[PDB]
Amino acid sequence: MAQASVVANQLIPINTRLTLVMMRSEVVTPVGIPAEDIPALVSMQVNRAVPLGTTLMPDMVKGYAA
């Protein structure tokens, strides 16, 4: 496994706009949103509560298409 995904660095409450301290990069399985996309995720809103350590998936971010 070499692809890193975006993983929640703290609990992200439902409907929170993402900030840089909320997102770390980690190689996890299954793969989620590419770690490379963390720039493009700032200020985007999550549509569900994301617990600490959870992989951010495409379907959890409102407006994410990439």
UniProtKB/Swiss-Prot annotation:
GO cellular component, one term: extracellular region
Site (Important for ice-binding): 10, 15, 19, 45
Subcellular location: Secreted
Gene3D superfamilies tied to this protein: Antifreeze-like/N-acetylneuraminic acid synthase C-terminal domain
Tissue and organ expression note: Detected in blood serum (at protein level).
Keyword Secreted recorded: yes
Domain AFP-like: 5-64
InterPro entries in the cross-refs: AFP_Neu5c_C, AFP_Neu5c_C_sf, Antifreeze_III
PROSITE patterns registered for this protein in UniProt: AFP_LIKE
Secreted keyword on record: yes
Key words, A-Z: Antifreeze protein, Secreted
Main location (coarse class): secreted
Similarity section: Belongs to the type-III AFP family.
Primary role: Contributes to protect fish blood from freezing at subzero sea water temperatures. Lowers the blood freezing point. Binds to nascent ice crystals and prevents further growth.
Descriptive protein name: Type-3 ice-structuring protein HPLC 12
Native source species: Zoarces americanus
